[PDB]
Amino acid sequence: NLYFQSMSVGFIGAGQLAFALAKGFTAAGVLAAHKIMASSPDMDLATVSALRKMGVKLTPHNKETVQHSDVLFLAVKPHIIPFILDEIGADIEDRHIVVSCAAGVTISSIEKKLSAFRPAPRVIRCMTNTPVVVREGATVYATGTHAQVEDGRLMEQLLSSVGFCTEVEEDLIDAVTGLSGSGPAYAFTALDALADGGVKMGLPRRLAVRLGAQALLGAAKMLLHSEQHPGQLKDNVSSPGGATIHALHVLESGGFRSLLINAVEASCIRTRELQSMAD
Amino acid sequence: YFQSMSVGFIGAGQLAFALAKGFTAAGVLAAHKIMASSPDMDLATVSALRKMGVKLTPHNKETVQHSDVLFLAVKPHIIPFILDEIGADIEDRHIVVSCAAGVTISSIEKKLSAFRPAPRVIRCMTNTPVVVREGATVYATGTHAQVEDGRLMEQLLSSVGFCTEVEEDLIDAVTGLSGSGPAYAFTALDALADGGVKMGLPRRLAVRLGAQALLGAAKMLLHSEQHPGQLKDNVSSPGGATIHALHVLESGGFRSLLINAVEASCIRTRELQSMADQ
Amino acid sequence: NLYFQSMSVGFIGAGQLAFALAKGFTAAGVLAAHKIMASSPDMDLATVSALRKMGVKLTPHNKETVQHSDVLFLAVKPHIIPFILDEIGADIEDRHIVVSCAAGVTISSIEKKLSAFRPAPRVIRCMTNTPVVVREGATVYATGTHAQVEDGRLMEQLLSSVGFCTEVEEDLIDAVTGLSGSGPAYAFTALDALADGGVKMGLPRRLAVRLGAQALLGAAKMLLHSEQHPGQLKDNVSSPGGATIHALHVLESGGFRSLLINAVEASCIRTRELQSMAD
Amino acid sequence: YFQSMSVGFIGAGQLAFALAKGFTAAGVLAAHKIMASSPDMDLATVSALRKMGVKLTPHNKETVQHSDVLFLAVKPHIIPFILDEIGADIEDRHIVVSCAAGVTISSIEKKLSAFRPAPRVIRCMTNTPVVVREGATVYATGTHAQVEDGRLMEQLLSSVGFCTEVEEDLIDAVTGLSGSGPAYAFTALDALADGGVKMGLPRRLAVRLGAQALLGAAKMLLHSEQHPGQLKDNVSSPGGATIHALHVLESGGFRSLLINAVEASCIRTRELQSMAD
Ligand SMILES: NC(=O)C1=CN([C@@H]2O[C@H](COP(=O)(O)OP(=O)(O)OC[C@H]3O[C@@H](n4cnc5c(N)ncnc54)[C@H](OP(=O)(O)O)[C@@H]3O)[C@@H](O)[C@H]2O)C=CC1
Ligand SMILES: NC(=O)C1=CN([C@@H]2O[C@H](COP(=O)(O)OP(=O)(O)OC[C@H]3O[C@@H](n4cnc5c(N)ncnc54)[C@H](OP(=O)(O)O)[C@@H]3O)[C@@H](O)[C@H]2O)C=CC1
Ligand SMILES: NC(=O)C1=CN([C@@H]2O[C@H](COP(=O)(O)OP(=O)(O)OC[C@H]3O[C@@H](n4cnc5c(N)ncnc54)[C@H](OP(=O)(O)O)[C@@H]3O)[C@@H](O)[C@H]2O)C=CC1
Ligand SMILES: NC(=O)C1=CN([C@@H]2O[C@H](COP(=O)(O)OP(=O)(O)OC[C@H]3O[C@@H](n4cnc5c(N)ncnc54)[C@H](OP(=O)(O)O)[C@@H]3O)[C@@H](O)[C@H]2O)C=CC1
Ligand SMILES: O=C(O)[C@@H]1CCCO1
Ligand SMILES: O=C(O)[C@@H]1CCCO1
Ligand SMILES: O=C(O)[C@@H]1CCCO1
Ligand SMILES: O=C(O)[C@@H]1CCCO1
């Protein structure tokens, strides 16, 4: 177990991801809010104000975030990453671990930029998701060419405080993006629709929202704690001739399964395009 | 808080195991204060209840005599036969909690009232995630259930997940939403994992990531004051990977399928309510 | 607020957009009709005659419009824009603000043409829509390379008199075109169909058109004045088991949402396509 | 013009709140002339209505005693219970205005006439945009409504939107069109915003632009003597962006989905009543 409670963390970008991670870390108690600095050009944004009330240091100056930070998260859109690297590359020091969270952007492209200024930049690529805000994120990371022995362990310890975290080979991360990165939006869509179905059949909206969300949470937790296949868990719900198997039929008749496959594929493929676009 | 109270299950299958495991993990009931009965003493769910410390028997009358709260955890078409069997054994102290999909309070009271008047009946709809103490449960109180009977039930079932009282005429819809709900999620998680596998993830990792993503999103919604659509908006950046995937969901009518599912399960439950009452 | 009550405005092109803007500006009382001039090569057109009855000055000669104008709107079709710039480029003076309304046409292409004649053309690109004719348009604009300090402020002040107006980065305007530029046609199609539905269920056509249009106007205004997500207002107004949620289901079963996404995307892509051909 | 008139709401939900707020914003009633009652009123609604100047009570009989015009703004299956509760308290002066989907004048008059003959009953269908004074309202007059009662109703509801008299047999169809209409619009605006976001717009800007486009287009049609198809033709330049988007709407049967929606809501409305009768 590595000690990191005293280190300073910075976010280039002060948007949804910066807020979600900063909220998760502080709510986990593993970092003090004043250890965190975030920067963006527009300092009148809603996420910036949300970060403000949390106690995070805010500035328009990306260089200040770099000078403040030990671990530096890149939390801008993919096409902005190369501009950021040109802007702050000269301010990267030997102490810095650069953790890119941008969809699609390769370690190789980041190291190429930063190596123009200083050899051996310590780079880690991450994909996470917004439920880090409730400490139930799904995070993977890959270590770059010059990442020190314990840089990967440090990032795993830090990110494990706000959800599941595991090291992966970098060539998996675009597919992770399509599954758990975009995944919450799939779930919010599903929850909205399930609530609509509950309302159609006579439930108050607030109850339908609560029951749907609790059903999804409980089922997901069951699967995480089970050694059983999701199909077996499915079999355990449905009684012969019963209500559940009738509902499963109408899902199958609409190709429900194929739509979720389509979604993971579409997000992964778009992620690969966001890299060739920023390239 | 629930010291001295005895609980019994008529039926020893998926739901009886789930509830018994959840109650005992919650510490609200000692396993030996729980008795379950089913005809086949060799079944797998009875094997695990035994290892859990739950008293087991093949005779439904033993469960009735042991219990204060009596859970009916048999299939809907088996309830009328159970009530015929144990009807003469219902005492004044008993609270009979039917878990069966579609079986109406009216049908249970009519059966039991032939043996002794004022049976205290509660109908509930729960789901299998009570086994990890994250269930979703509603209940409706019967004609002769005392107000404190509904309160006791809510406190007991709140130990294993969300629990709230509803009017009985909403239980069919709840069945279609949170009762069948886990099966929709297991289907979705299997398909999401297939999608991860297609794009190059190992199956075990894809399952873990998809399930963690669903759990985290559901917790976000429960801990948020905000609309699911608002949370959808907040997490879909312009031109990004997520909004591209949302479009292909929309093009297949994803939302309508989940509406169809809740409706289909509810309507089938109503057909079961009509069988119970006819 | 800038004093511009006395300035002169010109339209190259005397068609649907020139009429809608001139009608909105004069109805707002911010420009006098005799301070507006519009040109097109055919002087017996219906929009020309409509502009005529409004008191706008009309001419076949684009050079006359340029010489008349302080603010010069380009309201010709996208493929006509480069010919106009070649025609009038030598007549552009220091006083001129050139406001292109053409779908897809980039500030860069306009400045490149005009710069061959005189350096530092003051260029603004906008996207608007025909409801400026009832002073409820939706307008965005981006400022060009040589736009002076108050050129953007002037154009926002002018266009705010006929609807919503805000500055954007130019790279958003093709998307805006697919949303609020083409938006009114989506609405007219929807209103025709809703009225057909009213008629099928027994309403006189005139009443069905009136009710459908009032419903759409009121709902849009409700959303604009609420601090609410449209899904929340959908949720709030629906009732369990009720008529609305049954109708929402049949919309969903048809993939209604996906069609509107398809439309915005198709209009935006077509807008981008035409400009790639122009380049 | 309604110097002394008092208005009551039985119910305090989405519709009662929207009408009370629209009437308040219109300034058509004197101060403290609105009362609303419900049995378990959400505290956020209590707070909002109280700050607005609206009187509140859990007792429906008190609303009746307060009111000259009494709006019934409860769910359709709740209407007959309300009529049984308040029927003995209806007075000569009262105009009872049912807002409930599906519920016929006939059924209301039969309930009320058991207590006192000649209840003055009006049935309306409106929509939540009355809250911004842009509602769409129709009404039908009952058997004993005096002719001036329908005139008063029209003048009152005209202060918060369009309002016109119809035969009662049109109201279920109106419900499917302008009653449910706003929900169709909110769905469309959410989808249009998703489309703007997909093509690169910030969500907040996409929502603002889509809503403004819808508002402006609707106002154009209301202020035009032309067919919506003709207004469509004026945007659709040959080979242009708009006609390309219209094609993909047509390829998905966009128009038929909206016809399906109006039909489905109207048919369900007829079931919200054929079940009650
Ligand atoms: N949100 C999610 O669900 C997840 C997102 N990600 C990744 O995180 C990154 C950001 O996503 P998200 O936070 O959602 O996007 P946001 O739009 O919410 O945040 C973007 C931030 O970048 C800021 N920014 C823009 N230009 C600069 C600049 N030159 N220097 C510094 N900051 C700048 C913006 O400020 P302004 O608005 O003022 O330009 C805004 O604060 C993306 O690459 C995405 O792939 C990864 C996992 C999950
Ligand atoms: N599983 C779920 O997801 C949920 C199910 N429910 C309801 O719970 C009830 C049971 O569900 P589930 O547990 O899944 O079904 P199972 O089939 O898994 O368990 C059924 C049990 O009933 C027993 N049984 C059959 N006949 C008798 C009898 N005459 N006397 C005593 N026990 C008997 C069976 O024993 P044997 O195997 O020996 O026949 C078995 O132990 C159903 O009514 C269902 O609607 C409600 C919410 C969630
Ligand atoms: N209509 C809309 O909904 C919106 C349109 N726009 C943009 O506005 C521009 C015009 O659109 P719209 O007004 O609809 O198209 P119209 O066809 O209605 O008007 C086009 C005008 O250009 C005139 N014209 C053709 N050649 C010349 C020329 N060489 N010199 C001067 N005028 C000429 C035409 O005259 P003749 O008929 O004699 O050729 C006609 O008066 C387009 O670029 C479009 O993208 C932007 C937002 C909304
Ligand atoms: N929502 C809409 O878009 C439109 C709805 N309508 C019609 O308006 C009526 C109400 O709809 P809506 O306002 O949406 O429904 P809501 O559910 O939002 O409001 C229902 C109201 O009825 C109240 N209520 C329930 N029982 C009683 C009672 N015994 N005495 C008094 N009040 C009671 C509820 O009380 P509590 O506050 O205690 O829960 C709540 O205030 C319906 O008939 C609907 O058809 C018509 C046009 C538009
Ligand atoms: O299909 C069934 O019978 C049960 C009821 C609710 C969960 O699945
Ligand atoms: O939509 C996107 O591009 C990012 C990546 C996954 C979460 O949201
Ligand atoms: O959904 C319903 O039943 C009501 C009537 C129309 C507006 O919402
Ligand atoms: O269809 C077109 O190309 C024009 C321009 C954008 C609005 O409608």
Swiss-Prot record, chains A, C:
PROSITE patterns per UniProt: P5CR
UniProt activity-regulation remark: Subject to competitive inhibition by the reaction product proline. Subject to competitive inhibition by stearoyl coenzyme A.
Protein's pathway: Amino-acid biosynthesis; L-proline biosynthesis; L-proline from L-glutamate 5-semialdehyde: step 1/1
E.C. number: 1.5.1.2
N-acetylserine modifications at: 8
Molecular-function GO term, any one: identical protein binding
Effect of residue 254 to E: In ARCL3B; results in a reduction of protein expression in skin fibroblasts from the patient
Localization (cell): Mitochondrion
Binding site residues for NADP(+): 12-17, 40, 62, 75-78, 101-103
Any one GO biological process: regulation of mitochondrial membrane potential
Biological role: Oxidoreductase that catalyzes the last step in proline biosynthesis, which corresponds to the reduction of pyrroline-5-carboxylate to L-proline using NAD(P)H. At physiologic concentrations, has higher specific activity in the presence of NADH. Involved in the cellular response to oxidative stress.
Listed name of the protein: Pyrroline-5-carboxylate reductase 1, mitochondrial
Organism of derivation: Homo sapiens (Human)
Lineage: Eukaryota, Metazoa, Chordata, Craniata, Vertebrata
Gene, per the UniProt record: PYCR1
Swiss-Prot record, chain D:
Record's subcellular location: Mitochondrion
EC number in record: 1.5.1.2
Effect on the protein upon substituting residue 225 to A: Reduced enzyme activity
Pathway the protein takes part in: Amino-acid biosynthesis; L-proline biosynthesis; L-proline from L-glutamate 5-semialdehyde: step 1/1
Reaction(s) this enzyme catalyzes, per UniProt: L-proline + NADP(+) = (S)-1-pyrroline-5-carboxylate + NADPH + 2 H(+); L-proline + NAD(+) = (S)-1-pyrroline-5-carboxylate + NADH + 2 H(+)
This protein's GO CC annotations: mitochondrial matrix; mitochondrion
Coiled coil: none
Catalytic EC class: oxidoreductase
Record-listed N-acetylserine modification sites: 6
Disorder cited: Cutis laxa, autosomal recessive, 2B: A disorder characterized by an excessive congenital skin wrinkling, a large fontanelle with delayed closure, a typical facial appearance with downslanting palpebral fissures, a general connective tissue weakness, and varying degrees of growth and developmental delay and neurological abnormalities. Patients do not manifest metabolic abnormalities. Cutis laxa, autosomal recessive, 3B: A disorder characterized by an aged appearance with distinctive facial features, sparse hair, ophthalmologic abnormalities, intrauterine growth retardation, and cutis laxa.
Function: Oxidoreductase that catalyzes the last step in proline biosynthesis, which corresponds to the reduction of pyrroline-5-carboxylate to L-proline using NAD(P)H. At physiologic concentrations, has higher specific activity in the presence of NADH. Involved in the cellular response to oxidative stress.
Known partners and oligomeric status: Homodecamer; composed of 5 homodimers. Interacts with LTO1.
Protein family membership: Belongs to the pyrroline-5-carboxylate reductase family.
Protein's name according to its UniProt entry: Pyrroline-5-carboxylate reductase 1, mitochondrial
Origin species: Homo sapiens (Human)
